[PDB]
Design an enzyme around this catalytic site. Structure first.
Site, short mmCIF file in Angstrom:
data_model
loop_
_atom_site.label_atom_id
_atom_site.label_comp_id
_atom_site.label_asym_id
_atom_site.label_seq_id
_atom_site.Cartn_x
_atom_site.Cartn_y
_atom_site.Cartn_z
N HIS A 140 -3.80 6.27 3.80
CA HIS A 140 -4.31 5.05 3.25
C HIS A 140 -3.69 3.79 3.92
O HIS A 140 -4.69 2.71 4.52
CB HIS A 140 -4.42 5.17 1.66
CG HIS A 140 -5.62 3.83 1.23
ND1 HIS A 140 -4.89 2.84 0.70
CD2 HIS A 140 -6.48 3.99 0.88
CE1 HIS A 140 -5.71 2.09 0.24
NE2 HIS A 140 -6.81 2.65 0.22
N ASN B 216 -13.91 0.16 -6.46
CA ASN B 216 -14.94 0.89 -6.06
C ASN B 216 -15.71 1.71 -7.22
O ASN B 216 -16.29 2.87 -7.03
CB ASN B 216 -14.56 2.23 -5.15
CG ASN B 216 -13.80 1.58 -4.08
OD1 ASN B 216 -13.82 0.68 -3.28
ND2 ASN B 216 -12.73 2.38 -3.47
N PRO C 106 -8.81 -15.23 -10.32
CA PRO C 106 -9.40 -15.96 -9.48
C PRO C 106 -9.02 -16.61 -8.40
O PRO C 106 -9.72 -16.89 -7.35
CB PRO C 106 -9.92 -17.16 -10.56
CG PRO C 106 -9.79 -16.30 -11.90
CD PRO C 106 -8.65 -15.61 -11.72
N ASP D 94 -15.33 -13.29 -3.63
CA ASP D 94 -15.32 -14.59 -2.91
C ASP D 94 -16.19 -14.18 -1.69
O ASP D 94 -16.54 -15.20 -1.00
CB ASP D 94 -13.81 -14.83 -2.60
CG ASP D 94 -13.15 -15.25 -3.66
OD1 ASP D 94 -13.21 -16.39 -4.06
OD2 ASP D 94 -12.25 -14.44 -4.23
N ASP E 60 1.01 -1.27 0.02
CA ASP E 60 0.08 -0.11 0.07
C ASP E 60 0.85 1.14 0.02
O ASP E 60 1.93 1.13 -0.71
CB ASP E 60 -0.87 -0.07 1.17
CG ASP E 60 -2.41 0.76 0.91
OD1 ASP E 60 -2.20 2.02 0.99
OD2 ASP E 60 -3.23 0.14 0.68
N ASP F 183 -27.41 -12.78 4.10
CA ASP F 183 -27.70 -11.56 4.92
C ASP F 183 -27.81 -10.05 4.28
O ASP F 183 -28.02 -9.19 4.87
CB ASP F 183 -26.94 -11.59 6.24
CG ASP F 183 -27.37 -13.13 7.08
OD1 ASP F 183 -28.41 -13.46 6.87
OD2 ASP F 183 -26.46 -13.46 7.69
N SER G 162 -11.09 -0.96 -0.18
CA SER G 162 -10.00 -0.94 0.50
C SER G 162 -9.95 -1.17 2.13
O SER G 162 -9.13 -1.63 2.72
CB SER G 162 -9.35 0.51 0.46
OG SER G 162 -8.74 0.71 -1.21
CA LIG Z 1 -11.23 -16.16 -5.66
#
Ligand SMILES: [Ca+2]
Length: 279
Positions: free
Chosen positions: A69, A161, A175, A200, A39, A260, A224
């Site tokens: 950040h 975002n 993936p 995921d 970062d 949920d 982030s």
């Molecule tokens: Ca994945």
């Protein structure tokens, strides 16, 4: 262990319900694990890090976080008050400049750096990398994230975002890593969160209080912010011996709160990170 008046995201990841404010977790707290925060850097001197954070690499004139950040993200991983894994070791890798930007070649080098550098560190419980960064699709950026994961590091990356399908962003679209979307305190998909079949998991990402530079704190929003909740959760679960770097993303999805979240597009997982901690 119970932390009262915790940030909502911490309370959320140890709860079957929204709307509570105590974070519950095993006292082992990710001790013996390591999390790399790739970062803008980390202000390691912040009292919130307690000597457990250090800069290990930069590609710029300084390793200091002149943005905030990276410090905020590292705080959500592992700070004493704002962190998921309150005893983990935090390693900062500054691939983003103080404006929050970085070239993909630098980001790729940072990932390959972590894959090697973990062999210089003591992380008997396992290694995680948190990548709250991204841009448009790049097969080379995805490949670097895939190598880092293959090397035995739990790689968590931000979905992005753009309120769009994460398939068009990197490293979000790789993936084999753990791609993290964002939710808010009422269990709604965050307004800006990317989505898509490549996600995921979701973690708390709207109005997240954490550390900031100048020994300060603030609340900000983003995928982030969701990503380090998941990175910290992985480090915490690996310390408990419940999962491994290779299998932690799958384990988190297996053990998530299911169904949920609201405003999850058809075809995107409705899974919210959850530590399943029972005292
Ligand atoms: Ca994945």
């Amino acid at each position: 262990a119970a932390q009262t008046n915790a940030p909502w995201g911490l309370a959320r990841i140890s709860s079957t319900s929204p709307g509570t404010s105590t974070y519950y977790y095993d006292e082992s707290a990710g001790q013996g694990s390591c999390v790399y925060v790739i970062d803008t850097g980390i202000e390691a001197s912040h009292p919130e890090f307690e000597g457990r954070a250090q800069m290990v690499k930069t590609y710029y004139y300084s390793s200091r976080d002149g943005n905030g950040h990276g410090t905020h993200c590292a705080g959500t991983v592992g700070s004493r008050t704002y962190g998921v894994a309150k005893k983990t070791q935090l390693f900062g890798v500054k691939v983003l400049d103080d404006n929050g930007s970085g070239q993909y070649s630098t980001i790729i080098a940072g990932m390959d750096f972590v894959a090697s550098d973990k062999n210089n560190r003591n992380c008997p419980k396992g290694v995680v990398a948190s990548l709250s960064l991204g841009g448009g699709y790049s097969s080379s950026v995805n490949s670097a994230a895939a190598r880092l994961q293959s090397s035995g590091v739990m790689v968590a990356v931000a979905a992005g975002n753009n309120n769009a399908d994460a398939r068009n962003y990197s490293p979000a679209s790789e993936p084999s890593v753990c791609t993290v979307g964002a939710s808010d305190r009422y269990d709604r998909r965050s307004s800006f969160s990317n989505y898509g079949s490549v996600l995921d998991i979701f973690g708390p990402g709207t109005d997240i209080l954490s550390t900031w530079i100048g020994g300060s704190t603030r609340s900000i929003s983003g995928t982030s912010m969701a990503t380090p909740h998941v990175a910290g959760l992985a480090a915490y679960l690996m310390t408990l011996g419940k999962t491994t770097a290779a299998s932690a993303c799958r384990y988190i999805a297996d053990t998530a709160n299911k169904g949920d979240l609201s405003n999850i597009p058809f075809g995107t997982v409705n899974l919210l990170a959850y530590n399943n901690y029972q005292a």
